[PDB]
Coordinates of C-alpha atoms in Angstrom, one line a residue:
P1 CA -27.8 -49.4 76.9
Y2 CA -25.9 -48.7 79.6
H3 CA -22.1 -50.1 79.5
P4 CA -22.1 -53.2 81.7
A5 CA -18.7 -52.9 83.4
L6 CA -19.6 -49.1 84.9
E7 CA -21.3 -50.9 88.0
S8 CA -18.5 -52.2 89.5
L9 CA -16.0 -49.1 88.6
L10 CA -18.6 -46.8 90.0
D11 CA -20.4 -48.3 93.1
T12 CA -18.3 -49.9 95.8
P13 CA -18.9 -49.7 99.5
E14 CA -15.8 -48.1 99.7
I15 CA -17.2 -45.0 97.3
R16 CA -20.3 -45.7 99.2
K17 CA -18.9 -44.5 102.6
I18 CA -16.8 -42.0 101.2
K19 CA -20.0 -40.0 99.5
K20 CA -21.8 -40.3 103.3
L21 CA -19.0 -38.1 105.0
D22 CA -19.1 -34.4 104.8
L23 CA -18.2 -32.8 101.6
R24 CA -15.4 -31.3 102.9
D25 CA -13.6 -34.9 103.7
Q26 CA -14.7 -35.9 100.1
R27 CA -13.2 -33.0 98.8
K28 CA -9.9 -34.7 100.2
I29 CA -10.3 -38.3 99.6
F30 CA -11.5 -37.9 95.8
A31 CA -8.4 -35.5 94.8
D32 CA -6.1 -37.8 96.3
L33 CA -7.6 -40.3 94.2
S34 CA -7.6 -38.3 91.1
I35 CA -4.2 -36.7 91.7
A36 CA -2.7 -40.3 91.6
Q37 CA -4.6 -41.5 88.6
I38 CA -3.4 -38.1 86.8
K39 CA 0.0 -39.0 87.7
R40 CA 0.2 -41.8 85.8
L41 CA -0.5 -40.5 82.3
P42 CA 2.2 -39.2 80.2
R43 CA 2.0 -35.6 79.8
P44 CA 2.3 -33.2 76.4
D45 CA 4.9 -31.0 76.2
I46 CA 3.1 -28.0 76.1
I47 CA 3.9 -24.9 78.9
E48 CA 1.5 -24.6 81.8
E49 CA 1.6 -21.8 83.9
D50 CA -0.4 -20.4 86.8
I51 CA -1.7 -16.3 86.4
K52 CA -3.2 -15.1 89.4
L53 CA -6.0 -12.9 89.7
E54 CA -6.1 -9.8 91.9
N55 CA -9.6 -11.4 93.7
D56 CA -7.1 -13.9 94.3
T57 CA -8.2 -16.9 92.0
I58 CA -6.1 -19.0 89.7
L59 CA -6.0 -19.0 85.5
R60 CA -3.7 -21.9 84.7
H61 CA -2.8 -21.2 81.2
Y62 CA -1.9 -24.4 79.2
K63 CA -0.1 -22.9 75.7
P64 CA 0.0 -25.6 72.8
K65 CA 3.1 -26.3 70.8
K66 CA 2.0 -24.9 67.6
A67 CA 0.4 -21.6 66.6
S68 CA -3.0 -20.9 67.9
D69 CA -5.4 -18.4 67.5
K70 CA -8.0 -19.6 69.6
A71 CA -8.8 -19.3 73.7
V72 CA -10.8 -21.7 76.0
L73 CA -11.9 -20.0 79.3
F74 CA -12.3 -23.7 81.0
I75 CA -14.6 -23.9 84.4
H76 CA -13.6 -27.3 85.9
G77 CA -17.0 -29.3 87.4
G78 CA -17.7 -30.8 91.3
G79 CA -20.5 -29.8 92.7
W80 CA -19.6 -26.4 93.6
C81 CA -18.1 -28.0 96.3
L82 CA -15.2 -30.4 95.0
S83 CA -12.5 -30.8 92.7
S84 CA -9.9 -28.4 91.5
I85 CA -7.9 -27.5 88.2
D86 CA -5.1 -30.1 89.4
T87 CA -8.1 -33.2 88.9
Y88 CA -8.7 -31.2 85.9
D89 CA -5.3 -31.3 84.5
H90 CA -5.2 -34.5 82.2
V91 CA -8.5 -32.9 80.2
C92 CA -7.3 -29.6 79.6
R93 CA -4.0 -31.0 78.4
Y94 CA -5.5 -33.3 76.0
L95 CA -7.8 -30.1 74.6
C96 CA -4.4 -27.7 74.3
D97 CA -2.4 -30.4 73.0
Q98 CA -4.7 -32.6 70.5
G99 CA -6.9 -29.5 69.9
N100 CA -3.8 -27.0 69.4
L101 CA -6.0 -24.5 72.0
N102 CA -4.7 -22.4 74.4
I103 CA -7.2 -23.0 77.7
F104 CA -7.3 -21.0 80.5
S105 CA -8.6 -22.9 83.3
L106 CA -10.2 -21.2 86.3
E107 CA -9.5 -22.2 90.1
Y108 CA -12.9 -20.9 92.1
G109 CA -14.5 -20.4 95.1
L110 CA -15.9 -23.4 96.7
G111 CA -18.3 -24.2 98.6
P112 CA -19.1 -24.5 101.8
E113 CA -16.4 -22.2 102.5
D114 CA -16.8 -19.7 99.6
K115 CA -20.8 -20.3 98.7
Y116 CA -22.9 -18.9 96.0
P117 CA -22.5 -16.8 94.4
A118 CA -18.6 -16.8 95.0
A119 CA -18.4 -19.2 92.3
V120 CA -20.7 -17.2 89.7
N121 CA -18.6 -13.8 90.9
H122 CA -15.7 -15.6 90.4
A123 CA -16.5 -17.1 87.1
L124 CA -17.4 -13.6 85.6
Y125 CA -14.3 -11.6 86.8
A126 CA -12.0 -14.1 85.1
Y127 CA -13.9 -14.1 81.7
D128 CA -13.8 -10.3 81.8
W129 CA -10.1 -10.2 82.6
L130 CA -9.5 -12.7 80.1
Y131 CA -11.5 -10.4 77.3
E132 CA -9.7 -7.7 78.5
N133 CA -5.7 -9.1 78.6
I134 CA -6.3 -11.3 75.6
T135 CA -4.0 -9.5 73.3
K136 CA -1.2 -9.9 76.1
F137 CA -1.4 -13.8 74.5
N138 CA -1.0 -12.6 70.5
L139 CA -4.8 -13.6 70.9
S140 CA -7.9 -11.9 69.9
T141 CA -11.3 -10.9 71.6
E142 CA -13.5 -12.6 68.7
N143 CA -11.9 -16.1 69.3
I144 CA -12.5 -16.9 73.0
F145 CA -15.0 -19.5 73.7
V146 CA -16.1 -21.1 77.2
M147 CA -16.1 -24.5 78.2
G148 CA -17.4 -26.5 81.4
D149 CA -18.5 -29.5 83.2
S150 CA -21.4 -30.3 85.3
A151 CA -21.1 -27.1 88.1
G152 CA -18.7 -25.8 85.5
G153 CA -21.2 -26.1 82.5
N154 CA -23.6 -24.0 85.1
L155 CA -20.8 -21.3 85.5
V156 CA -20.2 -20.9 81.4
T157 CA -23.5 -20.7 80.2
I158 CA -24.3 -17.9 83.3
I159 CA -21.0 -15.6 81.6
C160 CA -22.6 -15.9 78.2
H161 CA -26.2 -14.8 79.8
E162 CA -24.8 -12.0 81.8
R163 CA -22.4 -10.7 79.2
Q164 CA -24.7 -10.1 76.5
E165 CA -22.8 -7.6 74.6
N166 CA -19.6 -9.6 74.2
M167 CA -20.7 -12.8 74.6
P168 CA -18.1 -15.9 73.8
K169 CA -17.8 -17.0 70.8
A170 CA -19.2 -20.3 71.3
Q171 CA -20.0 -22.2 74.6
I172 CA -19.4 -25.7 75.3
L173 CA -21.3 -27.6 77.7
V174 CA -20.8 -30.9 79.5
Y175 CA -23.7 -32.3 81.4
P176 CA -24.7 -28.8 82.9
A177 CA -26.4 -28.3 85.8
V178 CA -29.3 -26.2 84.4
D179 CA -32.3 -26.8 86.3
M180 CA -31.8 -27.3 90.3
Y181 CA -35.5 -26.9 91.1
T182 CA -38.0 -29.4 88.7
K183 CA -38.2 -32.6 89.5
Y184 CA -38.2 -34.0 86.1
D185 CA -38.4 -38.0 85.5
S186 CA -35.0 -38.6 85.0
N187 CA -34.5 -37.7 88.6
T188 CA -36.0 -40.7 89.8
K189 CA -35.3 -42.7 86.6
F190 CA -31.5 -42.4 87.2
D191 CA -31.1 -42.2 90.8
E192 CA -29.3 -45.1 91.3
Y193 CA -24.8 -45.8 92.5
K194 CA -24.3 -47.5 89.2
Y195 CA -24.9 -43.8 87.4
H196 CA -22.6 -42.0 89.8
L197 CA -24.6 -38.7 90.1
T198 CA -27.3 -39.9 92.7
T199 CA -30.3 -37.7 94.5
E200 CA -28.7 -38.1 98.0
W201 CA -25.2 -37.3 97.2
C202 CA -26.5 -34.1 95.2
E203 CA -27.9 -32.3 97.9
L204 CA -25.0 -32.3 99.7
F205 CA -23.8 -29.9 97.3
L206 CA -26.4 -28.2 97.1
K207 CA -26.8 -27.3 100.8
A208 CA -22.9 -26.4 100.8
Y209 CA -23.2 -24.4 97.9
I210 CA -26.7 -22.7 98.5
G211 CA -27.1 -22.9 102.1
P212 CA -36.6 -24.6 97.1
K213 CA -38.0 -21.8 95.3
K214 CA -34.6 -20.0 96.0
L215 CA -33.2 -22.4 93.2
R216 CA -35.3 -20.7 90.5
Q217 CA -32.6 -17.9 90.3
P218 CA -31.3 -17.9 86.9
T219 CA -27.7 -17.5 88.3
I220 CA -28.3 -21.1 90.2
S221 CA -31.0 -22.6 87.3
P222 CA -29.9 -21.0 84.4
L223 CA -32.9 -22.3 82.2
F224 CA -34.7 -19.7 84.4
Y225 CA -33.0 -16.7 82.5
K226 CA -35.7 -14.5 80.4
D227 CA -34.7 -12.6 77.2
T228 CA -30.7 -13.3 76.3
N229 CA -29.4 -14.6 73.7
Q230 CA -26.8 -17.7 73.6
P231 CA -24.3 -18.4 71.2
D232 CA -23.4 -21.9 69.5
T233 CA -23.7 -24.1 71.6
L234 CA -22.4 -27.7 71.5
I235 CA -23.9 -30.1 74.4
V236 CA -21.9 -33.2 75.5
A237 CA -23.9 -35.3 77.9
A238 CA -24.6 -38.8 78.9
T239 CA -28.1 -40.1 79.0
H240 CA -28.0 -42.2 81.9
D241 CA -28.0 -38.9 84.4
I242 CA -30.4 -37.6 86.5
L243 CA -29.4 -34.3 85.3
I244 CA -30.6 -35.5 81.2
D245 CA -34.3 -34.2 81.5
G246 CA -33.1 -30.3 82.9
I247 CA -30.0 -30.5 79.9
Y248 CA -33.0 -31.8 77.1
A249 CA -35.1 -28.9 78.0
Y250 CA -32.0 -26.4 78.1
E251 CA -31.4 -27.5 74.7
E252 CA -35.0 -27.0 73.3
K253 CA -35.2 -23.7 74.8
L254 CA -31.6 -22.5 73.0
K255 CA -33.2 -23.9 69.5
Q256 CA -36.5 -22.4 69.6
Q257 CA -34.6 -18.6 70.7
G258 CA -33.0 -19.7 67.6
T259 CA -29.3 -20.6 68.7
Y260 CA -27.3 -23.2 66.9
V261 CA -27.1 -25.8 68.8
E262 CA -25.4 -29.2 68.5
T263 CA -25.1 -32.4 71.0
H264 CA -23.3 -35.6 71.4
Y265 CA -25.4 -37.8 73.5
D266 CA -23.9 -40.8 74.9
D267 CA -25.5 -44.0 75.9
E268 CA -23.2 -46.4 77.2
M269 CA -21.9 -43.9 80.0
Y270 CA -21.7 -42.0 83.3
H271 CA -22.5 -38.3 84.1
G272 CA -18.6 -37.5 84.7
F273 CA -17.1 -39.8 82.0
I274 CA -15.0 -37.1 80.5
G275 CA -12.8 -37.0 83.2
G276 CA -12.2 -40.7 82.8
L277 CA -10.0 -39.9 80.0
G278 CA -6.5 -42.1 79.9
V279 CA -7.7 -43.7 83.0
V280 CA -10.8 -45.9 82.4
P281 CA -10.4 -48.5 79.9
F282 CA -13.6 -46.8 77.3
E283 CA -13.0 -44.9 73.8
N284 CA -15.5 -42.7 75.1
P285 CA -14.2 -40.0 77.2
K286 CA -11.4 -39.4 74.1
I287 CA -14.4 -39.8 71.4
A288 CA -16.7 -36.9 73.2
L289 CA -13.3 -34.6 73.3
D290 CA -12.5 -35.0 69.8
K291 CA -16.0 -33.6 69.3
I292 CA -15.3 -30.8 71.2
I293 CA -12.1 -29.8 69.5
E294 CA -13.4 -30.4 65.8
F295 CA -16.7 -27.9 67.1
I296 CA -14.3 -25.4 68.1
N297 CA -12.1 -25.7 65.9
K298 CA -14.6 -25.0 62.7
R299 CA -15.2 -21.4 64.2

């Protein structure tokens, strides 16, 4: 039941031209389009502050109006090469305001200028900094969550695998990239312009981020982690997505290892739809974000 209005939004001659450009040019074009869309959205009256870390990355702290006990480390998507904290401001503002959540959004190194494993090292450094400094925000280490979409879902689940002695309270994975090696059925079935994420476009990101059995390394494809625990997990995904079969594989691995896993699989939307919040006419982005909020606030 792919929504029939999506093809005209996601596949245009303009979009096809942009997706063949150098990723450094795509980065600018896409950022400019996203920023202009975001500027049309009214903002909640929350306090935002950029915190520069010693490794030169930035954590943007979104502080809710009401008293809050929860912190969420959010890592944006973009194929490890595109997007920024600025192109995800509207999602974080909604989670902060409507969820009553402290959000810390990470600006990390992007390929091809800062190739793998720069982003992994930035994700770990940010989590360790937040864990150590949480009481500066009048928050406690027992209430730190991690959340990421796509490449960001990749990075936050790697945090959980790599920090077994102080895992997050829960992890929220939004259409995460967890297996860059295996060819599943979804990788052909949904490899079309109308579904946004195409195999052709994605291999540009792989070449810029990584540089193929050299894709089974667990800090690239966390499906390959061996003998690690994971916390309570919410997986949000679109079913019409080249990545979906690896995501199903991840869900099954987590369930078999004893992890509690909730899922929100949206069978009308496209990979990336949470970013459509307030822009696209559909209810689905807000529905997914509300489910995330209710999952965090139960904990």
